[PDB]
Amino acid sequence: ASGVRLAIVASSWHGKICDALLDGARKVAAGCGLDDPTVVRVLGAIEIPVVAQELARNHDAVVALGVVIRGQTPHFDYVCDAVTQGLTRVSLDSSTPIANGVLTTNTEEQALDRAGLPTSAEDKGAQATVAALATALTLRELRAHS
Template sequence: MSGHGSPTTEIPHQPGTRVAIVAASWHEQVMDGLLAGALRGVAEAGIEQPTVVRAPGSFELPVIADALARDHDAVVALGVVIRGGTPHFEYVCAAATDGLSRVALDHGVPIGFGLLTCDDEKQALDRAGLPDSIEDKGYEAAAAALTTAHVIAGLAADRAGATPGS
């Protein structure tokens, strides 16, 4: 399973962090699990009021994440694409992945990557953070975004306290 070897770090407590979650609408059961996991991760960080937005599908995640990254410290992007019999899977996965990477780099805002790219529905359900799932990718995406935001804030604080020439 792909979760083997994943880190076990705690999400830093950061109640002042402005976080948004954008979640696709396709595959409702999987998405409900991913969203619940992300919200649990955000709550563990002490954030009570995250912005939650639904996207029509995974292809639309980057454009909504881009809008959210303008006034949030971290964005968690959640979606699922399940392989079918056409190249649609490859196009949507590549566009969403490339778009989310671009948003992070263009804005300097961490994007928690919670886009499941699965061969079948069972793989998606196994990763959705549901009671019978073996992984919780929504929680992991939130943890990654919030931990990265904490690191970036620390780097900014270090730079602000640095003396010229250091």
């Protein structure tokens, strides 16, 4: 994957968990021969699609990282609807994979469990970067050459 132009946009709402996701994505990127992907920080998940849209203009793949955790109101449902709709539209408008590393949990421990910390069951940042890179390589192979 050393030739792929990779972008990562990570939100900052719930800082420790977001850093963990990013750390996972970067390590997968580096392990695949990419030492310097484009990394951009935004505040919350609502801000990801617009930044992903900009990044997709000149990258083969964008990894979307963030953490939405349910509060006391229906607001959680609408934040996740907005991000779902936006990323989906961005990937199709740009014909570019936007990988899903945006945790959507009922609880904080569930998010921690999926963030790739030493005792976590899995790592979404890593998983989303693999998805982005595999899908970019597939698309490159399907498209025009040579």
